[PDB]
Every structure is written in structure tokens, then in C-alpha cells.
Amino acid sequence: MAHVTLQSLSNNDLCLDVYGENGDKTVAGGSVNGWSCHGSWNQVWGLDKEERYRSRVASDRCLTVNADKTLTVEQCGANLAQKWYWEGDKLISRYVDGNNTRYLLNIVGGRNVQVTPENEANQARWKPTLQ
Amino acid sequence: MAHVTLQSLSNNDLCLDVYGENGDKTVAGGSVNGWSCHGSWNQVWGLDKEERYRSRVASDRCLTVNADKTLTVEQCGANLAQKWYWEGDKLISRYVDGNNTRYLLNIVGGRNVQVTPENEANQARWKPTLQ
Amino acid sequence: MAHVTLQSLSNNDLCLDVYGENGDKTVAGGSVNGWSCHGSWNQVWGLDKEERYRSRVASDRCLTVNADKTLTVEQCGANLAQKWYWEGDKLISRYVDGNNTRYLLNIVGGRNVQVTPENEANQARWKPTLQQ
Amino acid sequence: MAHVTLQSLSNNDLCLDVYGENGDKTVAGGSVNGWSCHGSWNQVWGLDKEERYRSRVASDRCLTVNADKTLTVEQCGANLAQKWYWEGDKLISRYVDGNNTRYLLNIVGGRNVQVTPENEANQARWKPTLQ
Amino acid sequence: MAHVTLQSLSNNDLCLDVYGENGDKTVAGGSVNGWSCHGSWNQVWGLDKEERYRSRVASDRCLTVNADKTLTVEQCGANLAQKWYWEGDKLISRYVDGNNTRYLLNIVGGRNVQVTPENEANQARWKPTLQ
Amino acid sequence: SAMAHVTLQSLSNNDLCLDVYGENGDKTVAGGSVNGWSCHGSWNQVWGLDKEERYRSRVASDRCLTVNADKTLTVEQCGANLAQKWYWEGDKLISRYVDGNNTRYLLNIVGGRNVQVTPENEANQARWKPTLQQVKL
Amino acid sequence: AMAHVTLQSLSNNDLCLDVYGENGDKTVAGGSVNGWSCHGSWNQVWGLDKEERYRSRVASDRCLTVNADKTLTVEQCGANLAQKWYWEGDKLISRYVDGNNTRYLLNIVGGRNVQVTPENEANQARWKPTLQ
Ligand SMILES: CC(=O)N[C@@H]1[C@@H](O)[C@H](O[C@@H]2O[C@H](CO)[C@H](O)[C@H](O)[C@H]2O)[C@@H](CO)O[C@H]1O
Ligand SMILES: CC(=O)N[C@@H]1[C@@H](O)[C@H](O[C@@H]2O[C@H](CO)[C@H](O)[C@H](O)[C@H]2O)[C@@H](CO)O[C@H]1O
Ligand SMILES: CC(=O)N[C@@H]1[C@@H](O)[C@H](O[C@@H]2O[C@H](CO)[C@H](O)[C@H](O)[C@H]2O)[C@@H](CO)O[C@H]1O
Ligand SMILES: CC(=O)N[C@@H]1[C@@H](O)[C@H](O[C@@H]2O[C@H](CO)[C@H](O)[C@H](O)[C@H]2O)[C@@H](CO)O[C@H]1O
Ligand SMILES: CC(=O)N[C@@H]1[C@@H](O)[C@H](O[C@@H]2O[C@H](CO)[C@H](O)[C@H](O)[C@H]2O)[C@@H](CO)O[C@H]1O
Numbered sequence: 001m002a003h004v005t006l007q008s009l010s011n012n013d014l015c016l017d018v019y020g021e022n023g024d025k026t027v028a029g030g031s032v033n034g035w036s037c038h039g040s041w042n043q044v045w046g047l048d049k050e051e052r053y054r055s056r057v058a059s060d061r062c063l064t065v066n067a068d069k070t071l072t073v074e075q076c077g078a079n080l081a082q083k084w085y086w087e088g089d090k091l092i093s094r095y096v097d098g099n100n101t102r103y104l105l106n107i108v109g110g111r112n113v114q115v116t117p118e119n120e121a122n123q124a125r126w127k128p129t130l131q
Numbered sequence: 132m133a134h135v136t137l138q139s140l141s142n143n144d145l146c147l148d149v150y151g152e153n154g155d156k157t158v159a160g161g162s163v164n165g166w167s168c169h170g171s172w173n174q175v176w177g178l179d180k181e182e183r184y185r186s187r188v189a190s191d192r193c194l195t196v197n198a199d200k201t202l203t204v205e206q207c208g209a210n211l212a213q214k215w216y217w218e219g220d221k222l223i224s225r226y227v228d229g230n231n232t233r234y235l236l237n238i239v240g241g242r243n244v245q246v247t248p249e250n251e252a253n254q255a256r257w258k259p260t261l262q
Numbered sequence: 263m264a265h266v267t268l269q270s271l272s273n274n275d276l277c278l279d280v281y282g283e284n285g286d287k288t289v290a291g292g293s294v295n296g297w298s299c300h301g302s303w304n305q306v307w308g309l310d311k312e313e314r315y316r317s318r319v320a321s322d323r324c325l326t327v328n329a330d331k332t333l334t335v336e337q338c339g340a341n342l343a344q345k346w347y348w349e350g351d352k353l354i355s356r357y358v359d360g361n362n363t364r365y366l367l368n369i370v371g372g373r374n375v376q377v378t379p380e381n382e383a384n385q386a387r388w389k390p391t392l393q394q
Numbered sequence: 395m396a397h398v399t400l401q402s403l404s405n406n407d408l409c410l411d412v413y414g415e416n417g418d419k420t421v422a423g424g425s426v427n428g429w430s431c432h433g434s435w436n437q438v439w440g441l442d443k444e445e446r447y448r449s450r451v452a453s454d455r456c457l458t459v460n461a462d463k464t465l466t467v468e469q470c471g472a473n474l475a476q477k478w479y480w481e482g483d484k485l486i487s488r489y490v491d492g493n494n495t496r497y498l499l500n501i502v503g504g505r506n507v508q509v510t511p512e513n514e515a516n517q518a519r520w521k522p523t524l525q
Numbered sequence: 526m527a528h529v530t531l532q533s534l535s536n537n538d539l540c541l542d543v544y545g546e547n548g549d550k551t552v553a554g555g556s557v558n559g560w561s562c563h564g565s566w567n568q569v570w571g572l573d574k575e576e577r578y579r580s581r582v583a584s585d586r587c588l589t590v591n592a593d594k595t596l597t598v599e600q601c602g603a604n605l606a607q608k609w610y611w612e613g614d615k616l617i618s619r620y621v622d623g624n625n626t627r628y629l630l631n632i633v634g635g636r637n638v639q640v641t642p643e644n645e646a647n648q649a650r651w652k653p654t655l656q
Numbered sequence: 657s658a659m660a661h662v663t664l665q666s667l668s669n670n671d672l673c674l675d676v677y678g679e680n681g682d683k684t685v686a687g688g689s690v691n692g693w694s695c696h697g698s699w700n701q702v703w704g705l706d707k708e709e710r711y712r713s714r715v716a717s718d719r720c721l722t723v724n725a726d727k728t729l730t731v732e733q734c735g736a737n738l739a740q741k742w743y744w745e746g747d748k749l750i751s752r753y754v755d756g757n758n759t760r761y762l763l764n765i766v767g768g769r770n771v772q773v774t775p776e777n778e779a780n781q782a783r784w785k786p787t788l789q790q791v792k793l
Numbered sequence: 794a795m796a797h798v799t800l801q802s803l804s805n806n807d808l809c810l811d812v813y814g815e816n817g818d819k820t821v822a823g824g825s826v827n828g829w830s831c832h833g834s835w836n837q838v839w840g841l842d843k844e845e846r847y848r849s850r851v852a853s854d855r856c857l858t859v860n861a862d863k864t865l866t867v868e869q870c871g872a873n874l875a876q877k878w879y880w881e882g883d884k885l886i887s888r889y890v891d892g893n894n895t896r897y898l899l900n901i902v903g904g905r906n907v908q909v910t911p912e913n914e915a916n917q918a919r920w921k922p923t924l925q
Binding site: 574575603604605606619620621 | 806832
Binding site: 180181209210211212225226227 | 269271272273274275277298299300301391392
């Protein structure tokens with residue numbers, strides 16, 4: 001299982017980053033957004049065999065789509081909200097709801113990163129980059 | 132043969148699951164429906180050379196389409212009602228009748244899982260996930 | 263020589279079956295129709311180098327189209343009425359006549375199996391299933 | 395060189411067969427027509443390097459197209475009337491004339507086999523069958 | 526180098542043939558035309574790496590297009606009038622002139638063989654046949 | 657695949673290679689100008705595409721071809737910015753640089769020996785050939 | 794180790810690209826290149842190197858070069874696109890650029906005169922690199 005950064009190709013310098021809550025990166029429910037690439041622990045990810053992106057911040061922290069379509073890291077489970085797959089430079093969640101669309105990892109403005117309906121995902125290019 | 136869980140891609144957390152009879156998940160004629168994924172032995176399946184999805188609850192328990200399009204596990208035989216094949220993420224039964232349609236594994240309501248005529252099957256996406 | 267059962271995909275449980283005559287499956291001239299699958303010697307077939315389906319019931323017994331479009335097993339010969347080939351899940355005879363048509367292995371009611379014009383063969387899907 | 399019978403797929407039992415003359419199946423100029431399959435020396439053929447179909451009845455005996463489009467076996471030579479080639483199940487002569495057509499090996503009624511202009515050849519399917 | 530006869534497929538028995546002078550097939554400048562196939566040395570040819578068809582009648586005798594479109598054998602040189610290439614069963618000269626047409630080896634009547642402008646070459650099928 | 661040392665020669669100008677000019681004759685300088693020059697193959701004309709899609713100059717360690725905000729080119733210490741990432745489509749050499757203008761930027765000769773990146777639809781002298789180059793240590 | 798080739802025209806029954814040189818001396822830098830009947834001596838033998846230059850065998854370091862007036866010479870080998878050549882079928886194309894918006898093709902322009910010509914006007918521009 002390769003350790004990578006998830007670097008945007010839609011922004012000259014933005015990597016997927018665990019902000020956390022109040023300086024602590026390791027907390028469950030910690031927010032995930034974007035930040036300049038420094039490759040520190042809170043910017044390193046690994047894709048496990050259940051298609052979860054595991055954070056290197058702490059054991060059992062997974063990239064998780066929330067109801068409001070923000071991103072957090074959470075304990076690892078079997079929910080589709082923690083499953084991801086690549087189509088080219090697009091990183092796509094398996095999360096489903098009533099809207100009949102796929103959700104793509106996407107910059108929504110400034111350093112904010114969420115998931116967005118596929119047709120409205122305009123800053124949604126990423127590169128898994130070997131550490 | 133490879134043992135898998137059959138997890139829905141149409142529902143954020145649902146696995147094909149042997150309900151059984153009165154809590155007992157090993158009896159022939161036991162019911163099959165959906166449940167949150169946990170991977171225990173009554174959510175584990177294997178596709179044999181005769182195209183039957185054998186359940187890991189006990190020997191001789193094959194996923195079977197009934198006359199009323201509901202699902203059980205039964206002793207393994209040659210009926211097409213026990214035969215399955217994949218097309219992409221659709222899991223299709225060989226079962227035939229007067230209606231001249233193919234039937235697909237489908238979530239009809241909530242945690243109820245049946246087979247459904249292909250043209251009306253809208254929660255019928257599945258992924259065979261290795262255990 | 264690849265041994266198979268010929269199971270219908272148009273019927274939930276039917277295989278091509280040598281009924282035989284008077285009890286005996288061994289006999290030449292014996293009838294062929296459908297039965298539930300058990301894979302015993304009289305439901306197993308093998309396609310030889312001359313495109314004949316030879317039954318495991320006994321030596322020298324090939325699936326044969328009759329003029330009544332009924333099916334039997336007979337002594338092996340050169341005749342086209344004994345030649346078969348696949349097109350997807352259709353099993354087609356090389357038998358020719360005036361109707362300018364191809365004949366398909368087909369279920370023609372209940373457990374009865376015969377060859378039927380391609381245009382009219384509504385239950386003619388088959389799956390040759392490897393056996394061992 | 396593979397020894398084959400030349401069996402029609404347009405008739406339920408007919409193989410290309412050396413008749414001979416008044417009995418003698420080795421006579422040069424002997425007739426070739428159709429007959430029930432039995433795979434004796436006079437029904438076996440080999441396609442040689444110069445595209446000739448040589449009969450097993452004797453040395454130096456090729457399948458030959460005549461002026462009146464019937465068929466005999468003759469001493470082997472260079473003439474295009476003794477050259478044959480396959481296109482699918484059609485067996486085609488290299489014979490040329492003023493009619494601007496290819497000539498196909500073809501059943502012209504009963505057991506009479508001859509060659510026929512391509513557009514007119516309705517019983518012209520053949521299978522070279524390894525004896 | 527493969528020795529071949531150049532047999533016509535547009536005539537039932539015609540091979541490309543060095544006529545020579547006075548029965549001597551070896552003479553430089555000797556005429557080339559058609560004859561019935563017998564595959565003696567004046568009907569055997571070899572295509573060399575410079576695209577010349579060399580005759581076996583003697584060394585240094587290449588098939589040559591003359592300005593009046595007749596064919597001779599001559600000493601081998603670099604002229605396009607001696608270069609030949611195949612497209613299907615057409616044998617095409619590299620000869621050029623102001624007419625902007627390719628010239629094809631063609632039977633122009635009886636046993637007369639010449640090169641003919643492509644669009645009029647109606648007896649221009651050939652087969653190179655290993656000796 | 658091992659990093660191949662190449663020159664980057666224009667196919668839009670009869671003799672122009674991408675060249676580190678440096679500053680005051682010092683070709684090794686961080687932030688030194690890159691432009692065009694006639695081809696001679698010395699270290700300040702030799703480049704290598706690394707695993708992070710950066711074109712490293714042979715002039716010295718840690719020098720990558722970089723798009724500046726005014727679209728001129730320099731060599732700078734190597735990092736993660738898209739302004740140092742490059743990829744080929746045929747004979748076009750394209751920057752991963754992004755801004756608000758809805759365009760890809762291509763390596764392009766903008767006049768004489770000046771080389772910049774230019775919006776794709778205006779990039780008229782933008783053909784290049786990476787040419788394998790022997791380098792002596 | 795470059796393959797020896799002559800560059801033989803396919804638009805003329807006997808013409809090869811040929812170093813004429815200067816004052817009878819075929820080795821000289823600046824020497825003229827035009828056409829001649831094919832004999833395959835060294836002033837007609839060429840090799841395509843790894844920089845896409847056609848090197849002549851008359852001497853070390855003599856490359857086929859397009860001049861600004863579109864005539865051809867041999868010159869010291871360097872990086873100029875005026876010395877680079879590539880094939881598309883039987884067309885031999887220069888990488889030379891100028892303000893005219895055209896590719897230039899090796900072309901016979903009358904008699905034994907060989908130059909490069911704009912693609913759209915090059916009517917005697919077929920060639921074959923012929924292995925010696
Ligand atoms: C308590 C507190 O705010 N501490 C901050 C750290 O959060 C901060 O680390 C950075 O945090 C951002 C999110 O705002 C992002 O996650 C960066 O990757 C991470 O390095 C640190 C550096 O700015 O300053 C502390 O004071
Ligand atoms: C007697 C009785 O009802 N016992 C139940 C178990 O059935 C139950 O196990 C779960 O059963 C559901 C079906 O309703 C499904 O098959 C689950 O996968 C299975 O684990 C257990 C947990 O709910 O509770 C017992 O009391
Ligand atoms: C002296 C003389 O004319 N001898 C001839 C032979 O040339 C001739 O050979 C045949 O000639 C034809 C061309 O006319 C062709 O080249 C044949 O391949 C070649 O065999 C021979 C046979 O007719 O007769 C002699 O009289
Ligand atoms: C101090 C000074 O100006 N020295 C110059 C060198 O810069 C120069 O080298 C050439 O510089 C050009 C850029 O102008 C390009 O980088 C060439 O590759 C490089 O060789 C040299 C030759 O022009 O002259 C020195 O005096
Ligand atoms: C001094 C002088 O003119 N000498 C000539 C040779 O140049 C000449 O060689 C031929 O020259 C032509 C071009 O004119 C072409 O390059 C031929 O390949 C080459 O052989 C030679 C033969 O004509 O005669 C000498 O006198």
C-alpha cells in the first residue's frame with residue numbers, strides 16, 4: 001500500500017490536509033481541507049484494500065464524506081462515504097443520495113475542499129503523488 | 132473459489148445477508164435480505180463453477196430465487212434459480228418465466244432485497260468484495 | 263474430447279436427454295428429449311472432430327435430426343443431419359431441406375425437445391456445461 | 395499435404411467422388427461427380443503446392459475443369475483449370491474466360507457436380523474434412 | 526533469393542518467358558513475352574534487393590521496360606525501367622514518363638506481354654510461383 | 657526509466673535551445689533567467705525530466721525550470737508547485753501552471769531569443785524536440 | 794554504424810543525390826549537392842545519423858544542408874534545422890523553417906537540379922533510400 005500526497009492539479013499548490021480541531025490533527029471528526037504541500041504527517045494518505053484513504057495522522061482515521069459534503073477523518077468502517085476510486089485525475093466518492101449524481105473531490109474556493117456533483121466539479125483534478 | 136461479501140453500491144451500507152429462521156442462520160429455506168456490513172459468516176459468499184453463490188453459513192446453502200422473487204438459501208442443485216452471473220456491477224439471475232425479462236438483485240425497500248425485472252431495477256448496483 | 267451436459271437457458275431445469283426405448287438408453291434409434299438435470303451418462307455429450315454430438319450411453323451413438331425434426335441417437339455417419347455447431351447460445355443443425363432455413367435445438371412444449379426453424383425457435387438457448 | 399474428403403454443406407450426404415470410365419477409377423479423363431460419403435481412395439483429395447487437388451486414386455491425377463464446365467481427373471500440369479482456392483466454404487477455380495465471372499464448385503442437380511458462374515451457384519458450400 | 530515463375534492469372538496457361546534470339550535465350554537485349562508454362566530456365570526469375578527481376582537464362586539479365594513499352598532482358602543497372610513491385614496480383618513498373626500514370630505488366634494480345642497504363646491493364650494479374 | 661539528459665531544441669526556429677542565462681555570467685544562481693540561445697549542448701543547455709515532472713537543469717543541484725507569475729522562465733530550487741511541472745503532447749511542452757484565464761500555457765518563443773509560456777491558442781512558435789545528450793562528468 | 798544508402802529519385806528514371814563539390818573536389822565544406830545518374834561511389838552514399846542529419850561519405854563531418862536560397866550543399870555538421878531531415882513515405886522533408894508557412898521537400902527542379910521546394914509545389918519529390 002503506497003503512501004502518497006493528494007496534490008491538486010487545479011491549484012498551483014494545494015494538498016489534501018487534515019486541519020483537525022484546535023491544533024490537534026489526530027482527533028476523530030477533524031476537518032479535512034486544503035493547504036500548501038509540505039508532506040508532513042497530516043498530508044499523507046494511503047488507499048487500503050477496502051478503498052478507504054487512511055490518514056497517516058493516527059491509526060484508524062479515514063477520509064469521510066459527511067452529510068453536508070464537507071470532509072473529515074473518522075474511524076474506519078464499511079460505509080460508502082469512506083470509499084474512493086480514481087477515474088483519470090478525478091477522485092470519486094461512492095457516497096449515494098437522492099440527487100442521482102456521483103460526488104467528486106473538489107476545491108470549492110480558496111483553500112476549501114469538499115465533494116461536488118460531477119457536473120459542477122470544476123477544480124476537481126488530483127494526482128496521487130508517491131512520498 | 133473466492134469468498135466475497137456482496138455489498139450494495141446503491142445504498143451507503145448494505146450487504147447481502149442470511150437472516151435465517153428465528154435467529155438461526157444455517158437452516159435450509161432461511162431468508163436472505165440486507166443488513167449493515169460486518170463480514171461475519173452469514174454475509175460471505177462464494178461463486179462456484181456451476182454459477183451458484185454458496186453461503187458460508189454451512190455446507191449446501193446456495194442463494195436461490197423463489198417463485199415470489201424473494202431470496203433464500205437452499206440445498207445446491209441444477210436449477211437456474213440458483214445461477215448467477217455478473218454484467219458490470221449488476222448481478223443477474225438466470226431465472227426464467229412468462230414475463231420475458233432478466234431479473235437483477237435489487238433493493239426494493241429499506242433492507243428488503245429481492246430480484247426485480249431489469250427495466251425497473253434502480254437500486255441494483257453491487258460489488259463483490261474480497262474477504 | 264470435451265464432455266458436457268446441454269442445459270437449457272429457456273427452462274429453469276431441463277437438459278438434453280436420451281430417453282431411449284422400452285427402458286434401455288443404449289439402443290440405437292432411441293428417443294431424445296428433455297429431462298431435469300442429473301448429469302448421468304445419458305445426459306452427457308461430446309462434440310467430435312466431425313461436428314457430431316456423441317452420447318456417453320454407449321459407443322457409436324450420435325445426436326441425429328430426423329425428417330420429423332425429432333431427435334434420436336444413431337450409428338455415426340457422414341450425414342449433415344448429425345452435424346451441429348454453436349452461435350452464441352444457439353445450437354444449430356447442418357441439416358438442409360427445401361425450406362431454405364437453419365434448424366435450432368429447441369424446446370417445443372413441456373419436456374419435448376426437437377429442432378425448429380430459426381425464425382420460430384423461441385426457447386432455443388442452451389449452455390454446454392463442462393463435466394468433472 | 396493433408397488428405398481430405400470434400401463434403402458438401404448444401405446436401406445432406408455428398409462427397410466429391412471420382413467415377414472413372416466404365417468402371418476404372420484411375421483412367422485419365424475419368425469423370426468426377428457426387429456420391430454418398432465413404433472416404434475410400436477415390437473420395438480422398440490433397441491440395442498441393444501448385445493449388446491442384448490431387449486424387450488418391452493414383453499418381454498424377456488432378457481435379458480438372460473442362461471447356462463445358464464439367465469435371466474430370468487429369469495428369470497434373472500448369473493450367474489454371476486445375477487450380478483451386480478457398481473463400482470460406484466456397485471452392486473456387488482459377489479458370490478464366492470471356493464471361494467475366496469466377497467459377498465455383500457447385501451441385502447442379504442430383505449428384506451432378508460441376509463449376510458454375512459465381513452469381514448462379516446456389517449449392518456451392520463445401521467442407522474439406524481431414525480423413 | 527526465391528526463384529519463381531511469373532504465371533498469369535488472366536490467361537489459362539501463360540508464363541513470362543525470355544524469347545531470346547535465334548533460340549539462344551541468353552543474349553542481352555533479348556525479347557520477353559508469354560508462353561505456356563514449362564518452367565525451364567527462360568521462365569525462371571528472382572527478385573533482387575534492388576527490385577530487379579533477374580532471369581535464370583544467364584547472369585546479368587534483368588527484366589526491362591523499353592520506351593515503346595515492350596520488355597527485354599538487359600545488363601542490370603540502377604534505372605527505374607528495371608525495378609518492379611507487387612500490389613496484390615499486380616506487378617507494377619517504377620518506370621516514369623511525362624504521362625503521370627503507373628505501368629502494369631499486362632497481356633496485350635495472344636502471347637504478347639508489355640506494360641500498360643494502370644487504368645487499361647485488363648489482363649494484368651500475376652502469381653509468383655516458387656520453382 | 658532513468659532520467660535522460662536532453663537538450664530542448666526548438667523546431668520553430670532554425671537554431672534555438674532552452675538555455676540558463678543565469679545572472680552576471682553565473683549560470684548556477686537560484687532564480688536565474690532561462691531563455692533561448694544557439695545550441696551548443698553545455699551543462700546550461702542540458703535538462704532532465706524527473707519523477708515529479710520537473711525539468712532539472714544540469715547547471716547545478718536543485719535547479720528546476722519554473723514558470724514565473726509574469727510567464728517568464730527561471731531555474732529555482734525544486735519543490736511541489738505546478739509552476740515547475742511540465743508534460744509533453746507531441747512536440748508541445750506544456751506547463752501544469754494554472755490561473756483564472758481558462759488556458760493551458762505552452763513553452764513558446766515570443767520573439768528573437770525570448771522564451772516564455774504562452775496561452776495555448778496564441779502559442780505559434782511552440783514546437784520542441786527533447787534531444788538525447790551525452791553528458792561528461 | 795549508419796546504413797549506407799543512396800538517395801535515389803523515384804520521379805526520374807535515373808537520378809541520385811550527388812555531392813558535386815567545388816572545383817572537382819568533393820570533400821569541401823560549402824560544396825554543391827545536385828543530381829546525377831546513380832553510380833553509388835562515395836559522393837552518392839549517405840547515412841542518417843541520430844540527430845536526423847544526412848552525412849555524406851565524401852569526408853568526415855559533411856552533412857546535407859538547406860541554404861537560404863533553397864539550394865543544397867554539404868557543410869560541417871551542427872544543430873541547425875537546415876541539416877535535419879525526416880521521411881514521410883517517399884517524401885524527404887527538411888526541418889528548415891522560415892516565414893513562408895510551409896514544409897520544404899527534397900525536389901527535382903529541372904534537369905539534374907535538386908533543391909528543396911514548398912510541399913504544395915513539389916512535383917518531382919519522390920525518393921527511395923536505397924541500401925548499398
Ligand atoms: C492551535 C493551532 O491553531 N495551531 C496551529 C496549527 O493548526 C497550524 O498547523 C497547520 O494548520 C493548518 C490548518 O489551519 C493545516 O492543517 C496545516 O497543514 C498545519 O500545518 C500551525 C502552522 O500554521 O500553527 C499552529 O499555531
Ligand atoms: C433469535 C433472534 O432474533 N436473534 C437475533 C439475531 O437474529 C441477530 O442476528 C442478526 O440477525 C439479522 C436478521 O434480523 C441479520 O442476519 C444480522 O446480520 C444478524 O447478525 C442478533 C443481532 O441483531 O440479535 C439476536 O438477538
Ligand atoms: C532456333 C529456334 O528458333 N529454336 C526454337 C526455340 O527458340 C523454341 O523455344 C521456345 O521459344 C519460345 C519463343 O518462341 C519460348 O521462348 C519457349 O519458352 C521456348 O521453349 C523451341 C520450342 O518451340 O523451338 C525451337 O525451334
Ligand atoms: C559576465 C558575462 O556576461 N559573461 C558572459 C557569459 O554570460 C556568456 O555565456 C553565454 O551566455 C548566454 C546568455 O547571454 C547563454 O547562456 C550561453 O549559453 C552562454 O554560453 C559568454 C558567451 O556569450 O560571454 C561571457 O562574457
Ligand atoms: C575538376 C572537375 O570538374 N573534375 C571532374 C569531376 O568533378 C567529375 O566527377 C563527377 O562530377 C559530377 C558533377 O559534375 C558528379 O559529382 C559525379 O558524381 C562525379 O563523378 C568527373 C566525371 O564527370 O570528371 C572530372 O573531370
